[PDB]
Write a protein that binds this ligand. Structure first.
Ligand SMILES: CC(=O)N[C@@H]1[C@@H](O)[C@H](O)[C@@H](CO)O[C@H]1O
Ligand SMILES: CC(=O)N[C@@H]1[C@@H](O)[C@H](O)[C@@H](CO)O[C@H]1O
Ligand SMILES: [Ca+2]
Ligand SMILES: [Ca+2]
Ligand SMILES: [Ca+2]
Ligand SMILES: [Ca+2]
Ligand SMILES: [Ca+2]
Ligand SMILES: [Ca+2]
Lengths: 308, 302, 80, 303, 309, 81
């Protein structure tokens, strides 16, 4: 008598629902199937710019502003006779103005999940033209080559400024009076000091939400640079499935992963979840000591200037 | 006892099977879709192409470069003998194979010429591979070029009104001195030109001193923040520019860019003739549409 | 008819087993889609800095979350 | 017979004969004497020879003359382009073949430099083919030369103390304006010289204005009878000369020739430093032994 | 009975005297015979001067003084672009000072009895240096060439001043507001007028000691210039022995000879006689209307200045 | 009685007086010639002052010549009727 008929008009319910979302995805799929081909079409033709070089130039932005470089825009510099002169975006405003932008995020128009070579060589758009104006007075998202960076940091005492912004418009800085990047041979080993910001000393102190060794092993100072195709992280395990930089993961100075990653994936809106991340990781543009764990910043950048 | 259920399960049996085939198909289509984005992602990997490019040819000056092979007038890196470092410039190369190192160009007034001493030394404005940009190379730069290898240099000045009509004026043995001597202008003489020798001064009509009071040969460069004029006051600050002023001028190319050309003492509170002028060719109240100052080793004469 | 039903319940469970399994399969496909949907959104924006034009597209996380929620609630019980 | 007189006539006969021979001889000697005076008169027919002579070479200026062939520094007739007429000048030509047209020379104070406007325009003093004379060529003349063909000219100033010690000061792009502009002095700059740039003014020490109050670049020429100085009073009349005065001077070459050089405010009732001075080389109370102002087309440069 | 005893002691007297003066001359002759050789010696070497040219110069003395020529001395002038600039003595004192000395006598240091060419070309010493001074501030006896003169007179309205002086220091002037000298072609025909002096109008009126035609034929105005080797005088006779300018006679504008001759022989002391003159003539520096006939002036000059209306 | 001797004597005497009377005239002129010469030279020498290094500081004694002149004319009167 304990026969169960319900499972004749109980299943159709646990079934009907399965039909809905299943068909829901089937259409959702073929929807994405279109957006891609459209973008693929757009891509038949590239984007272009025309940035005429300012007459004034120097070893870097500092010398330039000292030389009269008043406005923030793309400038051409040359650290020495050896290095071929290269384009860079100078920020002549912010603190004092001798700001040589080493990294910049603002809209997610550039792929940061790139391999070793692109990072060492540098990639992205430095600046872009404005409406009607001939010169490129606006920066673009980019990454100056590691070499280009390494060379500069080692050229003399360099101070590093890191500015960021949330999706609520709020901004915070992170100042490091000392900054260095070794040659490729030393795997671009990073070293900073003299913190004096407002966002949180994520580089020397690790995440302010972790305890004991957990916190201590997320410090980036003294860490090596790593890309999804080059392991140099603090994760010494022999297990292949465990690396701090997975595919399409920003190259950064990892150590048992991180406390911050300004090169992480650009998640729109800031907050993002595990079921959204490619590998179920915190791969976005994070800065734990400030906006927390699963939160990608709206604006993030790294500039450089000689510390006197 | 009815058991009219075994007949309904088979209805569900097919229902299940249907869904399975959809789930399985979706999975496949998804696998395909992923192989497409990878193909797309490959596209969006290069930056936007900047139409501007520098030439690999390098020399002591635009002329030396031309000799090496340069055929197009664009942006190159020159580096004289006593130069600390190289630096970009706009070269002008003609059919006869001449390299004109240009140090001043006006054409739209997009660049404010009211710049300080430092701004005139290191140079200001923008460089275009097509000379459609306005700028000032930099006295120090100009110095290094003109004063190198102790070899003879010359200067050509091209003017253009608002009717496309143009003229030129050349000066042999052109040279600009070091900063220690305020980048003083100097030339042996006027090599002729349909525009006239405004540098030889110009007796306007106010005073009989106007001529030698408006000569520019031997005059040091001055700015509002570095007066060196032969004027009790500050010619540079008055006109609002940087130039080799005497008791001011007769040939003032860094003057205020006046649209349409013609202006007056009405277009100024105290009424100055602070425009891009050249007395021998046009009025003191007719500003040029286009201006261009370039040099070249004298021996490539007409 | 003790057995002429003893085998029925047996076969039913077999069917309920196919269903319970599918739930798991969709769950993951749903998760796979969510990530894909997102992944693409990122790829397209990063394309803005390389191609003549980007796509003015949006993402409806809400719907997926609906589907997500609406699914977990169905996973409860079919036969003790 | 008693009276033998026919014996005395023969005595007289010879007496007569004697005289005839003397008269006849005198006549001859006279004829000879006349043939001698004619020979003498021929001697006294030419005037005394004046050691001074002008050279047949002529040009636009002493330099143009040298290019034509002139080798000795003497007196020649130059004539610029816009010149009404030619005029004599003293040229100085060196081994390198340079023609220095001189317009001012002091050396003994034989010439009074207290001259009026007209006397400074047309020029005063004397010209010697050996430059052992004192003079002032004339502003108008100086003007014509410096302002011709619009070509670059330069000025050298040579000084000498009472110990033979000398110095020079050069100014590039030298030029003197027309009378309409009171023959105003003008030059692009100082080309260097062991004597110093007095023309750049000189801050003596009385007032902090002294420097630009003693600069001579851009100053108009003035005389007691034609004030053009930047002084309330008459600098020219005060010092007693003709010069391009500002709030007077720092380099005054037409100043009073003070023998021995050194002087003071004692050597003047109101006490002026109206001597031939050059502040950068010597004191304001040390007058030069020798002064010489000469020009030449700038192109003779290399130093 | 008819005894001329005397002529035995009468003749010795008329004879003794003849012996005295005759021997007197014989020695006098050989005396002159020495003075000449001595002078001839002196002449082995010439006299010299060093006249440095004043900076200031003009078309002539007038322009010069207007140009600041204050002192009387030698100056260089140039009437026009054609003529080569020539030295002249400017007298910046006397009347007003624009005095261009055309002729000057003062000591007899220059031979005026010269031929046609020297006159046309000019001869003598213009000026001489002083003691210690470099420039030649003192004039010398001279004659500006006839051309040099002619050219000037014809350059514009020219006034002529003639100053003279006797051996007693007394001076007198002779002013002619009008003065001209034609070209060589017109034989340098002279013409003057507007007399206003103190010495006597000898040029337009002739000698004040002669009557009728005698006086009328000694007028120099309109007369031609004549030298001892070039007859153009008023003496039209065909007789060769009759010319107004004999050997060593000053060249001047004669007409049946003269009323005055500032180029005549410089007789020392003023008064001179017929038995002293070479040809027994009044060939000295005469000015009849003043000091008379046989009297040579101690000082005599001819200056020139542009007369303004 | 010595008619002839004296008759021819007086005759010859006159002949001698004739030689004398003639000489007077000759000297007269020679005297005049000298006077002029003496003067002529005085003039030539002074005119030399303006040409030669030095002139001669000479004088002229007209007085003496005039003496001689006077002293001669007085001798001319008569010797024999
Ligand atoms: C001392 C400490 O912090 N321990 C935590 C531990 O509780 C946690 O399970 C682990 C995973 O995040 O991280 C670590
Ligand atoms: C005043 C005058 O001249 N009288 C002369 C006279 O002495 C002379 O003898 C005569 C013959 O020529 O002619 C007349
Ligand atoms: Ca590892
Ligand atoms: Ca990637
Ligand atoms: Ca000034
Ligand atoms: Ca005054
Ligand atoms: Ca005749
Ligand atoms: Ca003679």
């Amino acid at each position: 008598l304990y026969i169960d008929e319900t499972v004749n008009s109980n299943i159709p319910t646990n079934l009907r629902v399965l039909r809905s979302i299943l068909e829901n995805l089937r259409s959702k799929i073929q929807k994405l199937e279109s957006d891609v081909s459209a973008q693929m079409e757009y891509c038949r033709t590239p984007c272009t710019v025309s940035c005429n070089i300012p007459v004034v130039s120097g070893k870097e932005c500092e010398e330039i502003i000292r030389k009269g470089g008043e406005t923030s825009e793309m400038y051409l510099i040359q650290p020495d006779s050896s290095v071929k002169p290269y384009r860079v975006y100078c920020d002549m405003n912010t603190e004092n103005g001798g700001w040589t932008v080493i990294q910049n995020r603002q809209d997610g128009s550039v792929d940061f999940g790139r391999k070793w070579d692109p990072y060492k060589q540098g990639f992205g758009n430095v600046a872009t033209n404005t409406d009607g104006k001939n010169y490129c007075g606006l920066p673009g998202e980019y990454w100056l080559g590691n070499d280009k960076i390494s060379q500069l940091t080692r050229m003399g005492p360099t101070e590093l400024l890191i500015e960021m912004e949330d999706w609520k418009g709020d901004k915070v800085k992170a100042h490091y009076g000392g900054f260095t990047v070794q040659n490729e041979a030393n795997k671009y080993q990073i070293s900073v000091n003299k913190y004096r910001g407002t966002a949180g000393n994520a580089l020397m102190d690790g995440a302010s939400q972790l305890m004991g060794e957990n916190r201590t092993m997320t410090i980036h100072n003294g860490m090596f640079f790593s890309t999804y195709d080059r392991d140099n992280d603090g994760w010494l395990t022999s297990d292949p499935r465990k690396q701090c930089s997975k595919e399409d993961g920003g190259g950064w100075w990892y150590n048992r992963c991180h406390a911050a990653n300004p090169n992480g994936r650009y998640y729109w809106g800031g907050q993002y979840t595990w079921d959204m991340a490619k590998h179920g990781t915190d791969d976005g543009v994070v800065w734990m000591n400030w906006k927390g764990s699963w939160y990608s910043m709206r604006k993030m950048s790294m500039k450089i200037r000689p510390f006197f | 006892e009815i058991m009219k259920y075994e007949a309904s399960i088979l209805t569900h049996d097919s229902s299940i099977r249907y869904l399975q085939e959809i789930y399985n198909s979706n999975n496949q289509k998804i696998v395909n879709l992923k192989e497409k984005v990878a193909q797309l992602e490959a596209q969006c990997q290069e930056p936007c192409k900047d139409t501007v490019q520098i030439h690999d040819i390098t020399g002591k000056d635009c002329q030396d470069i031309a000799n090496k092979g340069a055929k197009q007038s664009g942006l190159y890196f020159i580096k004289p003998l006593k130069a600390n470092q190289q630096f970009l410039v706009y070269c002008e190369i003609d059919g006869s194979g001449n390299g004109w190192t240009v140090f001043q160009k006006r054409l739209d007034g997009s660049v404010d010429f009211k710049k300080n001493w430092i701004q005139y030394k290191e140079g200001f404005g923008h460089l275009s591979p097509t000379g459609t940009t306005e700028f000032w190379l930099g006295n120090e730069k100009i110095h290094l070029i003109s004063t190198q290898s102790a070899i003879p240099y010359a200067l050509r000045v091209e003017l253009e009104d608002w009717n496309g009509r143009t003229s030129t004026a050349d000066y042999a043995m052109f040279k600009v001195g070091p900063e220690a001597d305020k980048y003083r202008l100097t030339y042996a003489y006027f090599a002729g030109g349909d525009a006239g020798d405004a540098f030889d001064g110009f007796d306007f009509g106010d005073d009989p001193s106007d001529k030698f009071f408006t000569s520019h040969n031997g005059m040091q460069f001055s700015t509002w923040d570095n007066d060196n004029d032969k004027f009790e006051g500050n010619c540079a600050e008055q006109d609002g520019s940087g130039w080799w002023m005497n008791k001011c001028h007769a040939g003032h190319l860094n003057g205020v860019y006046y649209q349409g050309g013609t202006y007056s003492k009405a277009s100024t509170p105290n009424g100055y003739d602070n425009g891009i002028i050249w007395a021998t060719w046009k009025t003191r109240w007719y500003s040029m549409k286009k201006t261009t100052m370039k040099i070249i080793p004298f021996n490539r004469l007409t | 008819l003790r057995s002429r039903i003893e085998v029925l319940k047996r076969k039913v469970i077999e069917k309920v087993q196919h269903i319970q399994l599918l739930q798991k399969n969709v769950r993951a496909q749903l998760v796979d889609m969510k990530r894909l949907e997102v992944d693409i959104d990122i790829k397209i924006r990063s394309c803005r800095g390389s191609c003549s034009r980007a796509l003015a597209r949006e993402v409806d996380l809400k719907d997926y979350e609906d589907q997500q929620k609406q699914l977990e609630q169905v996973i409860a019980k079919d036969l003790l």
